Structure formats: structure tokens, C-alpha cells
């Protein structure tokens, strides 16, 4: 399990999780606040 969690810490795996999280947050924000153009 230590080695498996080490594998998840490799750069490609971290980037996939990080961008999957980052993309999901942006997608969800635009789902509840559609069409943001000005801060207002």
C-alpha cells in the first residue's frame, strides 16, 4: 500500500487528479452561474 500510494504521487497521476479537480470546479461554477462576463 505504501508503494501504491507512492505510484499515485507520481507526476502524471497527480496532474490527472489535479486537473480533473480543477476542471470540475470550473465546470460546476459555470453550471450554477452560467454566462459570467462581468464581475458585477
Amino acid at each position: 500500500m505504501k508503494d501504491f500510494t507512492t505510484y499515485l504521487s507520481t507526476a502524471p497521476v497527480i496532474a490527472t487528479i489535479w486537473f480533473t479537480f480543477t476542471a470540475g470546479l470550473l465546470i460546476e461554477i459555470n453550471r450554477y452561474f452560467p454566462d459570467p462576463l462581468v464581475f458585477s
Binding site: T10, F39, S40
Partner: protein, 165 residues
Amino acid sequence: DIAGLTPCSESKAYAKLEKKELKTLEKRLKQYEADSAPAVALKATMERTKARFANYAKAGLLCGNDGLPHLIADPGLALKYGHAGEVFIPTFGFLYVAGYIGYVGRQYLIAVKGEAKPTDKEIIIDVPLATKLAWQGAGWPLAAVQELQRGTLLEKEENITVSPR
């Protein structure tokens, strides 16, 4: 108004644009049933279209002869006429996040330089350390300035390699 523009709420072309987009959606609607899945989706789109055009007019944007919103970038004109939310405020919104990301990465890079094998700490991320630095980055502007004044932000010219000249 500014630069010959007019508020979108008072723009004839802006109003006509909304009708064109709604008319296109309505034309596709009448080939389906009242409460079928395609019809519900189209009605949802029309609601968002109406909301979008109300929001931009309510925001007090400026529309050109094209009848499309235009943004004001000069800080003086923006604060003078209440357009700070177009470019000016988002300018400082982005820089906080951009500095946050950059400052957190710089802290992590310095942290692992002390380790025995820095290279293996870059391909294989030290997640416990990264999360610790991720939260402390919220105060980067304060920490960033204090480093600048104490003179530890920049390397010495004598410790940086350069090519022959």
C-alpha cells in the same frame, strides 16, 4: 456614452439581437412535442438566453453599433463611470490566483532543495508537504513583500552562472 458607445439596455441593435437568437430556438422547438425531452431542453436554453440578455443590460455594459457589449480597460474611465467589474476588478482577481499558484510552487521547490535527492522529489510529489504549502499560500502577497524588503527574494549576481562575454 463613452467613446460613442451606448448602454446596452438602451441599444436598439442589442434588443434586436435577442429576438434573433430566441427566434432561432423557437423555430426548432415547433418540430417536437410539448413536454418531450428535446422540447424541455430547448425551453431551458431559451430561459438562459433571456436571463443572459437581462443580466448584461442590468450590469450596465456599453454596446457599440454592432449591438454587442464592449469592455472598458482604462482604470480612470472604469472607476469614473462604474465599469470596474469588466477589467479592473478581474485584473486583481487574476493576479491573486496567479501569484498564489506561483508562490506555492516556489515554496515547494525551495523546500525540497534541502533534501538529499531533490530530483526524485519532483517527479514523485511529496503530497503531505504540497498540501501544507497549498494552504499557507493564501497570504502570499504579505509573505512575498516581506521577502523583497529583507533582500532574500533574489539571488546574488555572483551566485548565478553566465556565459562568456
